[PDB]
Amino acid sequence: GSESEEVVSREVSGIKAAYEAELGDARKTLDSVAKERARLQLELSKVREEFKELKARNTKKEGDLIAAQARLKDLEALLNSKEAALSTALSEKRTLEGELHDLRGQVAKLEAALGEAKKQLQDEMLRRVDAENRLQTMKEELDFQKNIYSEELRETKRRH
Amino acid sequence: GSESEEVVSREVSGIKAAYEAELGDARKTLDSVAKERARLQLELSKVREEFKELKARNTKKEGDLIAAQARLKDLEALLNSKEAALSTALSEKRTLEGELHDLRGQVAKLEAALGEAKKQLQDEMLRRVDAENRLQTMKEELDFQKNIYSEELRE
């Protein structure tokens, strides 16, 4: 009767209260996952941004690196050419200094030889001038000896 | 009249089934959001790994760049020193070639002067020898002419 209606009302209230407790524990787990989802969304948004910025920085750095490496290659090659040119120039200079030293010795040797050849020519010109003057005097003596021979024997044979 | 009691039995069974259905839907929704957490965790794991790899590559590239820039700076300076040294060496070489040209002209001028001084000495020595020979012959003629003078005046 009334005990049959009370047992159902207390049963429904029991199963109602159990469901309310379980759905409440399901709501509490739902918010927990909602917080973690929000944490991950923010953390993902942070890393994506950092990656975008890092990729932009790296793209610039790598392009700068390729350019530096190309310039380095060109400079190392030019430095090698310059060193070769310098090595040749110093070698050629060394040969010149040697030729120059040899020529300086030659000038000094030719100057001494020229001075002595001129000194000997000077003395010989004097001896030639003297010998030619003494010859003219000897020719003059011979003509005067031949003239006194003739002008005297012209008068000797006539005066006995 | 147990039809009045079958109404309450069907109501309780309906209440039970409705609460039982709400629990099943809440559990399937919890799965639905757990899938979305899993999606984000995987997506985050992917980007973190890509970033770690990119940061490692960039760290190496930047260190390589600093080194290249330092080497460039040193080279440009060394290249400038080498060009100055080269410019000096060619200038010094040019002065040497000038001194050499001047010395070669001096040797040629001294050689020509020496050859002509020797040629003049040669001709002068001949004139002296000839004049001294003609003088000795003239002295010999004068003594003969003075002796024939004394021998003819005798008789």
Side-chain angles (χ1 to χ4, degrees), chain A residues 8 11-12 15-16 19 22-23 26 29-30 33 36-37 40-41 43-44 47-48 50-51 54-55 57-58 61-62 64-65 68 71-72 75-76 78-79 82-83 85-86 89 92-93 96-97 99-100 103-104 106-107 110-111 113-114 117 120-121 124-125 127-128 131-132 134-135 138-139 141-142 145-146 152-153 156, chain B residues 12 15-16 19 22-23 26 29-30 33-34 36-37 40-41 43-44 47-48 50-51 54-55 57-58 61-62 64-65 68 71-72 75-76 78-79 82-83 85-86 89-90 92-93 96-97 99-100 103-104 106-107 110-111 113-114 117 120-121 124-125 127-128 131-132 134-135 138-139 141-142 145-146 149 152-153:
Chain A
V8 167
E11 115 168 50
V12 173
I15 66 109
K16 184 180 135 284
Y19 149 82
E22 284 247 330
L23 267 242
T29 311
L30 272 155
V33 182
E36 287 165 28
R37 276 179 66 189
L40 289 155
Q41 279 169 328
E43 197 37 70
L44 180 55
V47 190
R48 282 224 253 265
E50 287 181 336
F51 190 89
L54 179 62
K55 210 171 221 307
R57 182 180 172 87
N58 178 252
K61 294 295 162 194
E62 286 203 14
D64 280 5
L65 184 56
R71 185 92 187 89
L72 273 172
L75 287 181
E76 294 201 318
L78 176 58
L79 198 81
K82 289 288 161 197
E83 193 73 304
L86 186 51
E92 290 178 0
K93 207 189 136 195
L96 286 171
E97 284 161 323
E99 181 54 68
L100 204 76
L103 276 164
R104 282 196 295 254
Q106 223 187 312
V107 299
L110 285 159
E111 280 173 351
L114 181 60
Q120 287 315 111
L121 175 58
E124 276 300 314
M125 258 166 191
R127 293 191 58 173
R128 184 226 38 187
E132 285 184 331
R134 291 180 304 117
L135 185 66
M138 197 62 83
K139 192 203 277 176
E141 205 189 327
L142 191 87
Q145 254 289 141
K146 264 164 174 191
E152 186 266 354
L153 261 158
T156 306
Chain B
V12 174
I15 290 163
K16 281 175 179 179
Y19 288 160
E22 278 244 319
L23 265 147
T29 285
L30 269 162
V33 296
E36 295 319 298
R37 169 180 43 131
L40 289 159
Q41 279 169 328
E43 197 36 70
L44 183 55
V47 190
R48 282 215 181 111
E50 286 181 337
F51 188 89
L54 180 61
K55 203 176 156 281
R57 181 181 175 85
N58 180 73
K61 294 294 163 197
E62 286 205 16
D64 280 5
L65 185 55
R71 183 93 187 90
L72 272 172
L75 261 159
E76 293 192 6
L78 175 59
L79 199 81
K82 289 288 160 192
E83 185 60 354
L86 187 50
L90 296 157
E92 289 177 1
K93 206 194 257 178
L96 287 172
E97 285 161 326
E99 286 166 48
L100 205 76
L103 277 164
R104 282 195 213 262
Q106 223 187 314
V107 160
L110 285 159
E111 280 174 351
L114 183 59
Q120 284 170 48
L121 177 60
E124 278 302 310
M125 259 168 191
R127 292 188 60 172
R128 185 222 42 185
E132 286 182 332
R134 281 191 294 166
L135 187 65
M138 209 140 262
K139 193 202 179 284
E141 206 187 326
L142 189 88
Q145 256 294 141
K146 186 69 158 168
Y149 159 84
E152 190 79 291
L153 276 188

